[PDB]
Every structure is written in structure tokens, then in C-alpha cells.
Design a protein around this ligand. Structure first.
Ligand code: HAS
Ligand code: HEM
Ligand SMILES: CCCCCCCC/C=C/CCCCCCCC(=O)OC[C@H](O)CO
Ligand SMILES: CCCCCCCC/C=C\CCCCCCCC(=O)OC[C@H](O)CO
Ligand SMILES: CCCCCCCC/C=C\CCCCCCCC(=O)OC[C@H](O)CO
Ligand SMILES: CCCCCCCC/C=C\CCCCCCCC(=O)OC[C@H](O)CO
Ligand SMILES: CCCCCCCC/C=C\CCCCCCCC(=O)OC[C@H](O)CO
Ligand SMILES: CCCCCCCC/C=C\CCCCCCCC(=O)OC[C@H](O)CO
Ligand SMILES: CCCCCCCC/C=C\CCCCCCCC(=O)OC[C@H](O)CO
Ligand SMILES: CCCCCCCC/C=C\CCCCCCCC(=O)OC[C@H](O)CO
Ligand SMILES: CCCCCCCC/C=C\CCCCCCCC(=O)OC[C@H](O)CO
Ligand SMILES: CCCCCCCC/C=C\CCCCCCCC(=O)OC[C@H](O)CO
Ligand SMILES: CCCCCCCC/C=C\CCCCCCCC(=O)OC[C@H](O)CO
Ligand SMILES: CCCCCCCC/C=C\CCCCCCCC(=O)OC[C@H](O)CO
Ligand SMILES: CCCCCCCC/C=C\CCCCCCCC(=O)OC[C@H](O)CO
Ligand SMILES: CCCCCCCC/C=C\CCCCCCCC(=O)OC[C@H](O)CO
Ligand SMILES: CCCCCCCC/C=C\CCCCCCCC(=O)OC[C@H](O)CO
Ligand code: CUA
Ligand SMILES: [O-][O-]
Ligand SMILES: [Cu+2]
Lengths: 31, 554, 166
């Protein structure tokens, strides 16, 4: 298996989620 | 040189790259002053002693945006996405047309630069009416962009000539990339061409009293979204088809590389209302439909993420790397042509995460027109695209000029790309965080030093970045000039093949490849999608125009 | 070996792509959700509402800023706001807490932003058009309006105030 490529797409997932859910939480906080 | 007689396309490609890097240098001079400003430090007095024609922060910001994000990126895309397919096919581009495209760009640039430099078009790189710049800025710009229609013709011509000579062969990979890319660009470019011909030009000439600002922005963003994919895709063509060789491996999938580009062709253009989430007079259903389709335009980069990572990992393993991290350490980190796109891809992970945020309709109300936005786009264009082009100094330049890169120049290029990358990451932090604190973009906030007390912390990041990037820019100017004005010429370097990667061996999926080669068809699909996504709104707007008077507020 | 690495790469790539698609779909569902809630009131009205920027300060609901705030329902106020070079009228906008506010904002000159700090109100203001957005202030106090669209050399100091009365 491409363990290295998976590690990359994991970091990318976690980044996307932190950004997206972070801003979603700010959105509601300002609602 | 006997090399330019056999490959005259090398000289024209060099002229595009050089002029591109000169615009980047000029436009970038303003970037450190702007990072200091977003760090609440006012260095404009210094800048004005140095460059006495600069009348304001906002004239500096117009120059920075137009030179770096419009001019540099386009010239790079014209160099890469003509010369690479031409070398892959081993065929000469129509040289009359190649030079015509160059001179159109040069002349368009010179004519726009006049009013920009004279403080007659301080309207930024978006030039939103009713702010009213000098007609020459709109005319110079229109001619500059129209240069690219010539490039499109050049590549479609190459492709057709090749296909005539090779009936029933599938399009070679880099040429397939460039064909879908330039056809995507053609459909993308129509928004701005319409906006300029139908409104901005008659208006700045004095022919019509006003322009309707909503129609003007809508037609602007029809083009303003796909133009960023037009910046990005030349860096992607190198990242897929060149970087894996530089990394010491191979491209792990030709079909997955073609599929990403076909997804860009279909999805780059019908999504621009994601720049208009906060605009009146556009129906929220259609905002949602562009939001979904924008989330889909994300998928080709999500696919790129994996295909490219797996290609790098494969290279690292070929070079002996083992573990879960050994593959990374084994890669050629002494080679600036390898390092620069890799670092740019690392910063693209937060860059793309912020883009997916921005795309998410109601989430955009948190960040719109704040510093977050420049935080996102410095990661995408000012970091990945720019670093990839900088890394080309190190394989492409020698190939075009025969001029060797010395050991010392190599190490200097290493330091430049690292400082540039790290400076972009630090500023991304300061700008994303100031944006979440409601600091607006496009603002000389250093002139209102008590307006933003809550942003004190990320402001330190922007100062630091402004200094780190000043140093990276100075070293880059020094480096580029050392390599350009260099003594030695080794003609064999200009005759060496480009460093194009092989593709990993494995079936693969002919029929998918054959299906994606149905370019006429995929193009009509892309174009249908634009009528579907834009038509209904533009019918309504054009049937209810409300033009308004022009202003000069500088 | 190459055959085997290639096979494995394509297999796990298929898996990532499905996951990445799943994730994007969840975001699309989560956005859908916001659009069904009161938070979606800041999305501007889609309907075109054309006005004339050259006479907006002489006739119509923007001509007398002291009359800008109009009760339009039992818990609703419409506020006629002018964003202009380089200021907002009325100044301050005064509204009661916990009421639904329908801001109707236009400009007599260039595009301005209208970004109410601490809220999701963030709307472009186009001359000739009226931007309509809706919000209910839950907390009383002073809210700063920032112009977040470059409107000329006075842009960085173009601010206004909303006072939400207890
Ligand atoms: C080249 C330049 C650009 C790219 C690319 C770009 C991509 C996107 N953008 Fe954007 N953007 C927006 C949405 C997105 C979306 C969804 C994406 C996507 O296409 C992003 C997808 C990409 C990813 C999901 C990341 C994939 C990760 C990769 C491919 C790296 C992998 C790592 C590897 C392989 C390395 C591993 C190796 C090792 C050794 C470990 C939105 C709205 O939805 C706005 C308007 C916001 C507003 O309010 O104004 C916006 C505003 C802008 C502006 C401001 C325009 C202005 O002046 O007003 C620019 C210039 C810009 C540029 C660019 N943007 N963007
Ligand atoms: C030394 C490098 C650079 C630094 C320090 C820098 C810094 C900045 C800063 C701080 C801003 C925000 C200013 C404002 O909102 O008022 C800005 C705007 C911008 N930058 Fe850069 N920049 C640099 C290089 C790049 C390059 C290479 C690109 C493109 C390839 C670029 C494209 C842009 C654009 C498009 C704008 C926005 C212009 C506008 O809003 O009208 N920058 N940059
Ligand atoms: C290789 C390139 C990397 C370059 C890295 C550069 C690091 C910047 C300096 C850090 C030392 C700390 C110096 C700060 C001391 C003075 C602080 C100060 O006075 O603040 C600014 C002034 O107040 C505003 O008007
Ligand atoms: C290899 C590439 C890796 C690239 C990865 C980069 C992505 C960064 C993501 C998140 C940083 C978030 C920092 C921590 C979150 C801050 C939240 C917080 O403290 O919120 C304030 C709250 O209101 C209390 O005052
Ligand atoms: C490495 C260089 C890349 C640059 C990386 C940019 C960093 C921005 C990161 C994450 C955004 C997440 C949003 C943070 C949200 C925290 C606040 C929160 O959780 O909201 C609740 C609070 O009550 C609300 O007012
Ligand atoms: C402004 C218009 C001047 C345009 C000047 C154009 C000069 C064209 C030079 C060029 O690239 O054409 C080669 C030509 O045949 C000669 O050697
Ligand atoms: C080819 C070269 C130049 C085109 C000539 C264009 C010259 C047209 C001048 C019109 C003009 O400047 O009218 C401005 C007026 O004040 C309304 O904004
Ligand atoms: C290069 C592209 C330059 C575009 C300039 C001129 C093209 C033709 C413009 C034709 C002028 C029409 C103006 C007109 O008829 O004005 C209507 C007026 O607004 C109501 O009275
Ligand atoms: C596959 C491509 C996707 C195409 C279709 C995707 C979903 C669009 C459906 C409904 C939008 C409903 C949005 C209405 C939001 C209005 C909110 C409001 O009334 O604001 C105050
Ligand atoms: C505020 C944020 C500022 C900090 C931004 C940092 C973000 C990530 C840092 C570096 C990425 C480089 C990752 C990979 C570096 C690998 C180098 C390596 O493994 O070197 C091998 C050795 O030299 C034999 O070649
Ligand atoms: C605590 C954090 C402090 C903030 C950071 C200050 C910023 C820059 C320091 C300069 C770093 C220059 C990095 C050079 C790395 C380089 O050139 O590496 C070649 C290498 O062997 C692989 O490619
Ligand atoms: C990435 C490399 C490190 C970069 C910056 C160090 C972080 C600096 C944070 C220091 C806060 C300094 C400051 O200005 O403090 C806020 C406020 O003034 C309190 O009273
Ligand atoms: C040797 C190379 C490494 C050296 C690089 C340092 C590494 C990172 C840390 C700090 C730099 C901060 C520099 C910022 C300088 C001035 C900050 C400022 O303007 O202070 C505002 C204050 O909060 C309002 O009173
Ligand atoms: C004329 C516009 C051409 C744009 C259409 C490109 C697709 C096409 O014509 O496909 C057939 C190709 O020429 C066979 O080699
Ligand atoms: C709340 C959300 C949770 C976030 C937490 C991070 C999630 C991990 C991310 C991506 C996994 C993508 C890789 C999918 C692996 C697919 C398996 C596969 O394809 O395996 C086939 C192979 O042949 C076997 O034999
Ligand atoms: C194979 C398993 C598949 C199942 C996995 C599905 C993923 C679940 C994730 C999100 C669901 C959406 C939750 C929608 C509820 C959002 C409510 C919310 O956040 O409320 C905001 C605010 O407080 C009120 O106005
Ligand atoms: C590495 C990246 C680090 C990122 C760190 C992220 C920090 C985000 C902070 C705040 C967002 C929250 C906004 C919440 C809005 C409420 C503001 C408010 O109360 O507004 C004034 C009102 O007038 C009172 O009466
Ligand atoms: Cu009004 Cu900026
Ligand atoms: O434009 O992203
Ligand atoms: Cu876009």
C-alpha cells in the first residue's frame, strides 16, 4: 500500500476539516 | 546560435519567461510594504523616497495585483503550455503566431502600465465599476489578455497537425493537458472579453455614461474564477509530467493525470458566483448551485494530491527510503527544481482548505473581503504557482539558453525558494488570523493604527513575513540576474531533452483514455455547463440594466 | 513490483477519492442546513431592486437619515442605510435588541462593503442597487461597520456604528 501518499491525504483531510468546522463554528457563533 | 535556428520556439519561450519574471519582480517590490502595512507598520514614506511616482498604498496594490497575478502568471502559462507540448510532440509551433502573441502581450503591458504608473487607474486588479480608470488601462489589459487567444490557436494547430500524422493514436499526455487547458481558457476568457467590449471600453472612451456594476462584476467573475485555474494548470503540467523525473521516480498514472485536467476543463468556469455570495440581485438558489459545483472543482486537486503524493513516495522508495517518513528524506532536497514545487504543494494543503471554506456559501460571510482571502490566495498563486515557475529557472532556463547553473547559483536558488515558501506560510498565518478577526482586505490599515487592537498578534506575523519576503525577493533578483547575465554558454544544455517523466508500467485503462480523448465532445459539455450555470442569471441581468456614473476617488 | 506498486496505488486512490467525495457531500449537507435556519437571513435578497444613485440623497427613503429606521412588523424594523465616500448614514444606526432588522443599503457613488463586526452581516453595496439583508441582534451594545470593499483613498477610515438598544 502507498502508506506515504495516505499519510499526505490524512494531513490534507485533517486540515480541510479543521478549517471547515472551525469556520462553521464561527459562523454560528456570529449568527 | 545554431540552436535557435533549429528551435526558434526556445527564443520566443525565453522572451515570455523573462518578461514574466520582470513583472513578478516589479509587482513583488510592493508586497513587503503591504505585509508591513498588514503588520500595522507604515513604510510607505520610505517606499515613496525610493519610488517617487508612487502616490498611495492603493496605487502600489494595483501594481502588485496586476503585475504579479495577471501579467506574470499569464506569461508563464504562455511559455509552459506552448513550449512543453511542442517539445513532447517534437514539432515547431507556428512561429509567426508565437511572436505575434509575445508582442501583443508586451504592447498590451506597456499601454496599461502608462496610466497605472501615472496614478490614472488606481482601481486594483479587479477594476470594479464605478471606479473609473483611464481607457488605456482597459485597452492595454484587453490586448494583453487577447494575446492568449493566439496561444490557444497555436496549440490547437500543433495538436491537429500531430493527429493528422498519427490517425487513431491517443493524444500524448502533455499535449492532452495543454489542449483541454487552452480550450478551458477560451470558454473562461469570454466573461471578461464581454465585460470589456460591451461595457468597460465604451465607458472609458466616453461612449456610454455609466456601467451597471452588478452585470460588470458577474461577467468579471465568469472569467475571474477560471483565470486562477489558468494560473495553476501550467504548474500542474510540470508537477505531473516533469517533477516525478526530478524526484527520481515516474508519474504513477497517466489516466488519473488526464482525468484531473478533463475535470478542470468541465468545472473551472461555471462557478464564479462564489465570488458573489455577498452581491445583491443574484438569486440564492443559483449561489447554492455554484457553491456545489465549486466543491466539485475541488475534486481534481484532491485527485492531484494523491496521484502526486504517490508519485513522490514511489520516487523516495526507488531512492532507498523506507519507514513511513524515509521516502520523504530520500528525495532530492538539494535540487531547487524539485524543492520549489514540493514546498508550493505543501502550502497548497491549507491554501485548498481555505478555498473549500470560501466556496461554502454562508461560510463565506465569515471571511469575505477580509484578510483571510489574501491569506488563501498567497498560498495558491503567490506560493505554489510562483515557486513552481522559480524552480523552472533551474531546468528550463538552461534548456532555453544553454547557460549552466553553477553549484553556487543552485544553493542560492535553494535559499530563495525556502525563504519565499516560509515567508508565504508565515504571512498566510497572519492574514487568515487577521481575517477571522474582521480586518478588511485592500486597506492601508497602518494609517489607522488604533482601528484593529484585537489583531495585534497576527500583525507580528505579517511584519515578519514582510521582512523574510523582502530578503527572499532581493536574493531572487540577484539570482535571476546572475543566471541571466551569466558568462558561460554550453550549447549541449540547450539541446538536451526536457526532463519529462516516464509513466509507471501497468495495464492501464484504455477506453477511459480513449473516452477522455473525445475532446470535441468534452469541450461541448464544458460549454453547455456554462450556459446552464450562467445563462438564466445573465438573461435576467441584461434585461434589467441600471448603468450608473463613474468615479475617481484617488 | 512496478506492476504491484501501480495496482496498489490505484486501489487506495479509488478509496481516497470516495472518502474525499463523502466529505464534500457532508459539507454540502451542512451548508444546506444553514440555509434552512435564521442565520441565512444575511444572504442578500436575490430580487433586483433598482434605484438611482444620483438622487438617492434628495428623494426617497435615504434622503433623511433621521427617518431611516421604520417599524415594518410587530418585531421588525427596516433600516435605510447609505454607504458613501466615506461614511454611513445614519450614524449611528439605532435598533432594538431581539428585533428582526431588514437593512436596505445603497451607495450614491462607488461600491462599498458593509461588514458588521461580530455578525455574519457582510454585503457588497452597489450604486443603483439595493442590498437587503436580515439579522436579529441578540446582544445589546455598539457594533462597528467596516467598509471592506476598496472605494478609494478614504477606504481604510470608512467606518460606521450600529447601537443595539436594550
Ligand atoms: C492559483 C490561484 C488559485 C487557486 C488554485 C484557488 C483554488 C480555490 N479557490 Fe481561490 N477562492 C475561492 C475558492 C477556491 C476553491 C474551492 C479552490 C480549490 O480549487 C482548492 C482545491 C485544492 C485542494 C483541496 C488542496 C489539494 C492539495 C494538494 C494538491 C497538495 C498536496 C500535497 C502534496 C502532493 C505534497 C506531498 C509531499 C511531501 C514531501 C510530503 C473562493 C470562493 O469559493 C473565493 C472567494 C472568497 C471571497 O469571499 O472573496 C476565492 C478567492 C481567491 C482569490 C481572490 C480573488 C479576489 O481578488 O477577490 C484568488 C486570487 C484565489 C486564487 C486561487 N484559488 N482565490
Ligand atoms: C514578496 C511577496 C509578496 C508579498 C509580501 C505579498 C503581500 C501581499 C499582501 C500583504 C497583500 C494584501 C494587501 C491588501 O489586501 O491590501 C497582497 C495582495 C495581493 N497579492 Fe501579494 N505579495 C507577494 C507576492 C505575491 C505574488 C507573487 C502574487 C501573485 C503571483 C501576489 C498576488 C497578490 C494579489 C492578487 C493581491 C490582491 C490585490 C488586490 O486585492 O487588489 N502577491 N500581497
Ligand atoms: C534570512 C532572512 C530571515 C530574516 C528574519 C528577520 C527576523 C526579524 C528580526 C528579528 C529580531 C527582533 C528584532 C525586533 C526588535 C525591534 C522591534 C521594534 O522596535 O518594533 C518595530 C517598530 O516598533 C515598528 O515601528
Ligand atoms: C504538511 C502540511 C501541514 C499544513 C497544516 C496547516 C493547517 C493549520 C490548521 C489549523 C491550525 C489551527 C490552530 C489552532 C486553532 C485555533 C482555535 C482557537 O484558539 O480559537 C480561538 C477561540 O475563540 C479561543 O479564544
Ligand atoms: C501553515 C500556513 C497555513 C495557514 C493556516 C491558516 C490558519 C487558519 C486555520 C484554521 C481556521 C479555523 C477557524 C478557527 C475557529 C476558532 C474559533 C471557534 O472555534 O469558534 C467558536 C467561537 O466562539 C467563535 O466566536
Ligand atoms: C508598437 C509597434 C512596433 C512593433 C515592432 C515589431 C517588431 C517585430 C520583431 C519580430 O519579432 O519579428 C521578426 C521580424 O521578422 C524582424 O526580424
Ligand atoms: C490604438 C491607440 C489608441 C486608441 C485611441 C483611443 C483614444 C480615445 C480617447 C477618448 C477619451 O480619453 O475620452 C475620455 C473621456 O473623458 C471619457 O471618460
Ligand atoms: C475594441 C472594442 C471597443 C468598443 C468601442 C466601441 C464599439 C462600438 C460602440 C458603439 C457605441 C454605442 C453607444 C450608444 O449607442 O449609446 C447609447 C446611449 O447609452 C443611450 O443614449
Ligand atoms: C449537481 C449540481 C447541483 C445543482 C443543485 C444543487 C442544490 C440546489 C437546490 C436548492 C437550493 C436552495 C437554496 C435556497 C436558499 C435561500 C435562502 C434564503 O431564503 O435567504 C434569505
Ligand atoms: C508559521 C509557519 C511557518 C513554518 C512553515 C513550515 C511548514 C512545513 C515546514 C517545512 C516543510 C518541508 C517538509 C519536508 C522537509 C524535508 C527535508 C528532508 O527530509 O531533508 C532530507 C535531508 O536533507 C537529505 O536530503
Ligand atoms: C522558531 C521559528 C522561527 C521563525 C522562522 C524565521 C524564518 C526563516 C529562517 C531561515 C530559514 C532558511 C531555510 C533554509 C533551508 C534550506 O535552504 O535548505 C536546503 C535543504 O538542505 C533542503 O532543501
Ligand atoms: C512562526 C514563527 C514565530 C512567529 C512569531 C512569534 C509569535 C509572536 C506572538 C507575540 C505576541 C506579541 C504581541 O504583539 O503581543 C500582543 C499584545 O500586544 C499583548 O499585549
Ligand atoms: C536568525 C533568524 C530568525 C529571526 C526571526 C525571528 C523568528 C520569529 C520570531 C519573531 C520575529 C518578530 C519580528 C517582528 C518585529 C516587530 C513587531 C512589532 O511591530 O511589534 C508590535 C507590538 O505588538 C505593538 O506594540
Ligand atoms: C475551431 C474550434 C476548435 C475547437 C474544438 C477542438 C476539438 C476538435 O475539433 O476535435 C477534432 C480534432 O480537430 C481532430 O484532431
Ligand atoms: C469525521 C471524519 C473522520 C476523519 C478522520 C480521517 C479519515 C482518513 C482519511 C482518508 C481515508 C482515505 C483512504 C481510503 C482507504 C480505502 C481502502 C481501499 O481502497 O483499499 C483497497 C485495497 O485493495 C485494500 O486491499
Ligand atoms: C456510513 C455512515 C454515514 C453517516 C455519516 C453522516 C455524517 C454526519 C455529519 C453531519 C450531519 C449533519 C448534522 C446536521 C445538524 C447540524 C446542526 C447544527 O450544527 O446546528 C447549528 C445551530 O446550533 C442551530 O441553528
Ligand atoms: C493558526 C491560526 C490561528 C487562528 C486563531 C483564530 C481566532 C478566531 C477568533 C475569533 C472569531 C470569533 C468571532 C465571534 C464574534 C463575536 C464578536 C462580538 O461580540 O462583537 C461585538 C459586540 O458589539 C459586543 O456587544
Ligand atoms: Cu467604502 Cu471602502
Ligand atoms: O478564484 O478562487
Ligand atoms: Cu473563484
Amino acid at each position: 500500500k502507498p502508506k506515504g501518499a495516505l499519510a499526505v491525504i490524512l494531513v490534507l483531510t485533517l486540515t480541510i476539516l479543521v478549517f471547515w468546522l472551525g469556520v462553521y463554528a464561527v459562523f454560528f457563533a456570529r449568527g | 546560435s545554431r540552436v535557435y535556428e533549429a528551435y526558434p520556439e526556445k527564443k520566443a519561450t525565453l522572451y515570455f519567461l523573462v518578461l514574466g519574471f520582470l513583472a513578478l519582480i516589479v509587482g513583488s517590490l510592493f508586497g513587503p510594504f503591504q505585509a508591513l502595512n498588514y503588520g500595522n507598520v507604515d513604510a510607505y514614506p520610505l517606499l515613496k523616497r525610493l519610488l517617487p511616482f508612487v502616490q498611495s498604498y492603493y496605487q502600489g496594490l494595483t501594481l502588485h495585483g496586476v503585475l504579479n497575478a495577471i501579467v506574470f502568471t499569464q506569461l508563464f502559462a504562455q511559455a509552459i503550455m506552448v513550449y512543453l507540448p511542442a517539445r513532447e510532440l517534437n514539432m515547431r509551433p507556428n512561429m509567426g503566431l508565437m511572436w505575434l502573441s509575445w508582442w501583443m502581450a508586451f504592447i498590451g503591458l506597456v499601454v496599461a502600465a502608462l496610466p497605472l504608473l501615472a496614478n490614472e487607474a488606481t482601481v486594483l486588479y479587479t477594476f470594479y465599476p464605478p471606479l473609473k480608470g483611464h481607457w488605456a488601462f482597459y485597452l492595454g489589459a484587453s490586448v494583453f489578455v487577447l494575446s492568449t487567444w493566439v496561444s490557444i490557436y497555436i496549440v490547437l494547430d500543433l495538436w491537429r497537425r500531430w493527429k493528422a500524422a498519427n490517425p487513431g493514436k491517443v493524444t500524448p499526455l502533455v499535449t492532452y493537458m495543454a489542449v483541454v487547458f487552452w480550450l478551458m481558457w477560451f470558454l473562461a476568457s469570454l466573461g471578461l472579453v464581454l465585460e470589456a467590449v460591451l461595457f468597460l471600453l465604451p465607458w472609458s472612451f466616453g461612449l456610454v455614461e455609466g456601467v451597471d456594476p452588478l452585470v460588470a462584476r458577474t461577467l468579471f467573475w465568469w472569467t475571474g474564477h477560471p483565470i486562477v485555474y489558468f494560473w495553476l494548470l501550467p504548474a500542474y503540467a510540470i508537477i505531473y509530467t516533469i517533477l516525478p523525473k526530478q524526484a527520481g521516480g515516474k508519474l504513477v498514472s497517466d489516466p488519473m493525470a488526464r482525468l484531473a485536467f478533463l475535470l478542470f476543463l468541465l468545472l473551472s468556469t461555471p462557478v464564479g458566483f462564489h465570488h458573489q455570495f455577498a452581491d445583491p440581485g443574484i438569486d440564492p438558489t443559483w449561489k447554492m448551485i455554484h457553491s456545489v459545483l465549486t466543491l466539485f472543482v475541488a475534486v481534481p486537486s484532491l485527485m492531484t494530491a494523491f496521484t502526486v503524493a504517490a508519485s513522490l513516495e514511489f520516487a523516495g522508495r526507488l531512492r532507498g527510503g523506507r519507514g513511513l517518513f524515509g521516502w520523504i528524506r530520500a528525495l532530492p532536497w538539494d535540487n531547487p527544481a524539485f524543492v520549489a514545487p514540493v514546498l508550493g504543494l505543501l502550502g497548497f494543503i491549507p491554501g485548498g482548505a481555505g478555498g473549500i471554506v470560501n466556496a461554502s456559501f454562508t461560510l463565506d460571510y465569515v471571511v469575505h473581503n477580509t484578510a483571510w482571502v489574501p491569506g488563501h490566495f498567497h498560498l495558491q498563486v503567490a506560493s505554489l504557482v510562483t515557486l513552481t515557475a522559480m524552480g523552472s529557472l533551474y531546468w528550463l532556463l538552461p534548456n532555453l539558453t544553454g547557460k549552466p547553473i553553477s553549484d553556487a547559483q543552485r544553493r542560492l536558488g535553494l535559499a530563495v525558494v525556502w525563504l519565499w515558501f516560509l515567508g508565504m506560510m508565515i504571512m498566510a498565518v497572519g492574514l487568515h488570523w487577521a481575517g477571522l478577526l474582521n480586518v478588511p482586505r485592500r486597506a492601508y490599515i497602518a494609517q489607522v493604527p488604533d482601528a484593529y487592537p484585537h489583531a495585534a498578534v497576527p500583525m507580528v506575523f505579517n511584519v515578519l513575513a514582510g521582512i523574510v519576503l523582502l530578503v527572499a525577493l532581493l536574493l531572487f533578483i540577484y539570482g535571476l540576474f546572475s543566471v541571466l547575465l551569466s558568462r558561460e554558454r554550453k550549447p549541449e544544455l540547450a539541446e538536451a531533452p526536457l526532463p519529462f517523466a516516464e509513466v509507471i508500467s501497468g495495464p492501464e485503462d484504455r477506453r477511459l483514455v480513449l473516452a477522455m480523448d473525445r475532446i470535441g465532445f468534452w469541450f461541448a459539455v464544458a460549454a453547455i455547463l456554462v450556459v446552464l450555470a450562467y445563462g438564466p442569471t445573465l438573461v435576467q441581468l441584461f434585461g434589467h440594466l441600471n448603468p450608473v456614473p463613474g468615479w475617481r476617488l484617488w | 513490483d512496478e506492476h504491484k506498486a501501480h495496482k496498489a496505488i490505484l486501489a487506495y486512490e479509488k478509496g481516497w477519492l470516495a472518502f474525499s467525495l463523502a466529505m464534500l457531500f457532508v459539507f454540502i449537507a451542512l451548508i444546506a442546513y444553514t440555509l434552512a435556519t435564521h442565520t441565512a437571513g444575511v444572504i442578500p435578497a436575490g430580487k433586483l431592486e433598482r434605484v438611482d444613485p444620483t438622487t438617492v440623497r434628495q428623494e426617497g427613503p435615504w434622503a433623511d437619515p433621521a427617518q431611516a429606521v421604520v417599524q415594518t412588523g410587530p418585531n421588525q424594523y427596516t433600516v435605510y442605510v447609505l454607504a458613501f465616500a466615506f461614511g454611513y448614514q445614519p450614524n449611528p444606526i439605532e435598533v432594538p435588541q431581539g428585533a428582526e432588522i431588514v437593512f436596505k443599503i445603497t451607495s450614491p457613488d462607488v461600491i462599498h462593503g458593509f461588514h458588521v463586526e461580530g455578525t455574519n452581516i457582510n454585503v457588497e453595496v452597489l450604486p443603483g442597487e439595493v442590498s437587503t439583508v436580515r439579522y436579529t441582534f441578540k446582544r445589546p451594545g455598539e457594533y462597528r461597520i467596516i467598509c471592506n470593499q476598496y472605494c478609494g483613498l478614504g477606504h481604510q477610515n470608512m467606518f460606521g456604528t450600529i447601537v443595539v438598544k436594550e
